[PDB]
Design a protein around this ligand. Structure first.
Ligand code: SF4
Lengths: 48, 82, 158, 512, 189
């Protein structure tokens, strides 16, 4: 036996709130930080 | 390539704290106060709610307290606790 | 200002180690003289007079022990003494060049004789947050948080 | 003021709980508002809102005002939300200046918000029953003596009185009673002769009705300022000078205004006659100290006259400025070393200066002064003036003159401290909530051990209960305890800085 | 033990079901949707109890299936603390004896709940028993056993919602007590 979860999430848009983002929250959203200038690895694999 | 540790090394470190009978007395007084303001009607905790079942024991350990009422002359005539 | 840089410039560094050790030596010796003054508490006018560690006599102390064999006469010593008069080691007591030995030379007694402060380290610097570099960067909600702040942790761990 | 808002929040949580915290934070975030909109925005039951608001107004955390169209507006004072931190300080100073009876008087007055003479003296006498035993009894005479001494010494102040109904606005009463404060009876204690022996917890009409009293925080702060000044002078010059400063502050207090930069005129003759006789000092000796103090390069006191030969006036604002300076240089020196404190105080004296002069004037080596000058520029501890060489103010056509700003400094150091107290409370609470499981597990067994002890139960429980896992965890409990202790001590200390910061930002503020 | 709880929900009915009267269709759908599963807050749903109220049946654009909302009540398994109960054994364990209620099985009788004299077995997982005068450490509880009498003393819900981006224990738990006289195997009483 297993605990029940709702199976549907169907919903409709009602409003759009505009605004800006705080830097701590902006970092929280971001997955990672980019830190290297260059684009691809020096080797002939063209890997990022 | 690698962003640093979240916790960089710092040479300057926090100055050592004080101690003494006076400081210990103030710490004891602080402990006393944080233990004190829990024990009077001004500490308005949430009223008891959502009883589970009609247990017989409730006749005994029911918490009884007076309906606190300040000097009502000193407040507007709009918030009577009844 | 180039090769000159003040003759302390030697090694093209202002000879940082020698200038700082010379400043420390000057400070400690004039503390010793002002300490004779304070120990004696000489009838306080003369207590403060002996606390005027004569900086002509400091200058003659610093030529010897092989310290200031480099250019010493007023200008260079007086200006290193002045580099010590910059900061809280000292407070205004020159009374111009006329009162005292050329004003005890830039006032190299002034209140070096008594740098004695008036307050211990702020409770803030005692706490971790105070010194904690990521002080404002300790966004509790985010990665750095007091509930994990390695500094707080350490500070409290010891 | 988000840091402050958080401090309010966590103080309300610590001292009052959840609903009180909610209402408090909402009010300080919204300002004066009538009851209905507050209840609407909060969405909680109006009974809880009412109860909260009356408990806050009982402790004077909030106020109510009659407003246009007859509505009643309710406002909260944010500053008062930062005073419970100093309750230990108030209790300590009253214990230092008065016996434990005065300590209990101040404790009751603070924790009750307001009290009347009969109520406070009776409650103090009743609570003191835990302090005296072996047949010792407590009578309200000594309690009343200590309270009247407190009130006379300005440490206890009377609350505003309600207006007389039969004398003003006869007929239907207004929505709010509109209390009125009276100053001539500020320290006029009510008269009573009732005495009651305290009941020693055996478990077996007000003549001063409406005459409420409350602690004088201003008097406490003034006393703290005097203590700080006396301490400052003690470290500065000598204990004898410090005692002189303790003295002329004493006659200053009884007549000087709290906000005036300069005290009332004080002569040396009155200082000498009021000077304690326990110190071997003559009038000429006193005059010498006062003359040489007035000659102090820090201009701590000024002559300001010649009446009676010896005539002097202390400069409170200038002393506070020196205090503010010293504390700021304190932070700098531990954060950056003596050299940083050297470079700044150079700049403090040399109002305008650039890198080359700084280096020349301190032999801060090349490739060392510039980088450090960039660092504490980044800390906002230094302001760049940047005069032009051309009206375009181009970077190639400007000079980088450095300039100090003490007031802005004192402010965002104070903000640093505010964030300081907060994240401590965060950790203290984090530690408390993480350890609460072991705490309750140890408290229940401790209560079991402590229980049925006087009943005469057998001794086969002390060792048999200790075999539990908490016994090899008591050292960890003590580890938590000292950690909280060590946190609390720093909080206490931080409050000691806060006093200096708040005092100077207040004095420099003209309030116009 | 059995509790009846009020419930509201919205349901979709595909068009081929229009032939049947609407209440019975919505009833059987609601039953299959609810029946034989547990709620994190009120316990194990058994079956609908009754359908109280019905709204108007809409037909949203982009679909042909009538939508509607129901007010209804349902019967849920949710014993209260200190409740007496009788149930079969299902297996012994070092941490206690597992008890089965036929349709539910997450009941444990820990050794703290078991009688003090018997604290461990002769290395055989079958829990043994010990008393003072009779029952000379020879009686033992069979993994199936009878419907032993016991009183619940603890209960807990544990959530098992998915964690992290997409691509075993029961979520509802109880503890029983058997120490008091009269509890356990009826053969003893
Ligand atoms: S990181 Fe931790 S110790 Fe540092 S300021 Fe933030 S809360 Fe305080």
């Amino acid at each position: 036996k297993e605990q029940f979860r709702e199976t549907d999430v169907a919903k409709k848009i009602s409003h759009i709130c505009f605004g800006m983002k705080s830097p701590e929250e902006m970092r929280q959203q971001a997955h990672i930080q980019v830190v290297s200038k260059n684009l691809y690895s020096q080797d002939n694999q063209h890997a990022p | 390539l690698k962003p640093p540790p979240l916790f960089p090394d710092t040479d300057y470190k926090p100055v050592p704290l004080k101690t003494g009978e006076g400081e210990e007395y103030m710490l004891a007084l602080k402990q006393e106060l944080r233990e004190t303001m829990k024990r009077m009607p001004y500490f308005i905790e949430t009223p008891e709610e959502r009883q589970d079942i009609e247990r017989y024991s409730k006749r005994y350990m029911k918490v009884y307290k007076e309906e606190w009422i300040p000097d009502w002359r000193r407040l507007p005539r709009e918030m009577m606790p009844r | 200002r180039s090769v000159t840089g003040g003759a302390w410039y030697s090694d093209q560094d202002f000879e940082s180690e020698f200038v700082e050790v010379l400043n420390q030596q000057c400070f400690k010796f004039l503390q010793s003289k002002a300490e004779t003054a304070r120990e004696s508490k000489q009838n306080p006018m003369i207590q403060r007079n002996s606390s005027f560690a004569s900086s002509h006599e400091v200058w003659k102390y610093i030529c010897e022990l092989g310290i200031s064999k480099v250019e010493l006469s007023m200008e260079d010593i007086e200006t290193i003494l002045n580099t010590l008069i910059y900061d809280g080691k000292v407070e205004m007591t020159i009374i111009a060049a006329k009162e005292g030995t050329v004003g005890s030379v830039d006032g190299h007694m002034k209140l070096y004789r008594a740098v004695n402060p008036i307050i211990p380290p702020t409770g803030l610097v005692r706490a971790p947050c105070g010194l904690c570099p990521v002080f404002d960067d300790c966004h509790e909600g985010g990665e750095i948080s007091p509930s994990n702040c390695i500094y707080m942790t350490e500070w409290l761990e010891f | 003021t988000q840091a402050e808002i958080k401090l309010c929040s966590l103080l309300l949580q610590e001292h009052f709980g959840e609903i009180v915290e909610k209402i408090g934070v909402h009010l300080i975030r919204t300002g004066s508002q009538p009851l209905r909109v507050i209840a609407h925005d909060t969405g909680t039951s109006l009974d809880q809102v009412k109860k909260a608001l009356c408990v806050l107004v009982q402790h004077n955390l909030v106020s109510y005002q009659v407003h246009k169209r007859g509505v009643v507006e309710y406002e909260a004072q944010c500053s008062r939300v930062l005073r419970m931190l100093r309750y230990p300080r108030y209790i300590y100073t009253t214990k230092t200046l008065y016996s434990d009876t005065g300590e209990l008087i101040v404790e009751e007055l603070l924790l009750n918000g307001k009290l009347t003479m009969s109520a406070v003296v009776k409650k103090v006498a009743d609570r003191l029953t835990e302090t005296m035993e072996d047949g010792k009894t407590m009578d309200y005479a000594e309690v009343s003596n200590t309270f009247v001494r407190l009130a006379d010494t300005h440490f206890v102040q009377r609350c505003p009185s309600v207006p007389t109904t039969e004398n003003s606005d006869p007929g239907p009463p207004p929505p709010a009673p509109t209390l009125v404060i009276n100053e001539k009876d500020m320290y006029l204690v009510p008269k009573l002769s009732l005495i009651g022996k305290g009941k020693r917890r055996r478990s077996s009409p007000i003549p001063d009705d409406g005459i409420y009293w409350q602690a004088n925080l201003d008097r406490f702060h003034q006393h703290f300022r005097d203590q700080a000044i006396v301490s400052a002078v003690a470290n500065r010059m000598d204990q004898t000078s410090s005692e002189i400063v303790r003295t002329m502050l004493r006659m200053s207090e009884i007549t000087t205004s709290s906000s005036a930069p300069f005290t009332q005129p004080l002569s040396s003759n009155e200082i000498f006659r009021s000077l304690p006789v326990g110190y071997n000092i003559s009038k000429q000796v006193l005059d010498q100290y006062l003359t040489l103090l007035a000659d102090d390069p820090l201009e701590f006191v000024g002559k300001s006259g010649d009446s009676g030969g010896g005539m002097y006036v202390i400069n409170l604002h200038k002393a506070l400025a020196s205090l503010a300076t010293a504390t700021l240089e304190s932070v700098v020196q531990e954060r950056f070393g003596s050299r940083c404190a050297r470079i700044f105080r150079l700049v403090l004296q040399k109002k305008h200066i650039e890198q080359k002069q700084v280096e020349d004037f301190a032999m801060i080596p090349a490739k060392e002064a510039k980088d450090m000058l960039y660092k504490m520029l980044s800390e906002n501890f230094m302001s760049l003036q940047e005069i032009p060489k051309t009206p375009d103010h181009a970077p190639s056509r400007t000079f980088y003159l450095y300039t100090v700003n003490i007031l802005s400094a004192a402010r965002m150091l104070l903000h640093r401290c505010y964030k300081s107290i907060a994240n401590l409370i965060e950790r203290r609470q984090f530690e408390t909530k993480e350890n609460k499981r072991l705490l309750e597990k140890s408290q229940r067994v401790e209560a079991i051990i402590a229980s049925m002890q006087a009943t005469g139960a057998e001794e086969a429980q002390l060792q048999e209960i200790e075999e539990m896992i908490t016994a090899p965890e008591r050292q960890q409990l003590e580890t938590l305890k000292r950690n909280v202790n060590k946190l609390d001590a720093s909080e206490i200390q931080v409050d000691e800085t806060i006093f200096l910061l708040e005092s100077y930002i207040e004095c420099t503020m003209k309030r116009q | 033990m059995f509790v009846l709880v009020e419930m509201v929900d919205t349901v979709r009915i595909p068009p081929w079901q229009f032939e049947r009267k609407l209440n019975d269709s919505i009833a059987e759908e609601l039953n299959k949707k609810l029946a034989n599963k547990v709620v994190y807050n009120v316990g194990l749903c058994i079956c609908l109890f009754d359908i109280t109220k019905l709204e108007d049946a809409y037909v949203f654009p982009g679909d042909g299936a009538s939508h509607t909302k129901v007010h209804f009540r349902c019967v849920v398994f949710h014993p209260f603390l200190d409740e007496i109960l009788i149930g079969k054994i299902k297996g012994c364990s070092p941490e206690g004896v597992h008890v089965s209620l036929g349709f539910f099985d997450d009941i444990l009788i820990p050794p703290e709940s078991l009688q003090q004299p018997a604290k461990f077995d002769e290395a055989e997982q079958v829990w043994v028993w010990e008393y003072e005068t009779e029952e000379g450490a020879h009686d033992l509880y069979m993994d199936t056993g009878e419907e032993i009498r016991f009183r619940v003393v603890d209960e807990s819900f544990v959530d098992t919602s998915p964690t992290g981006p997409s691509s075993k224990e029961a979520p509802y738990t109880l503890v029983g007590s058997i120490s008091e006289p009269g509890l356990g195997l009826l053969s003893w009483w």
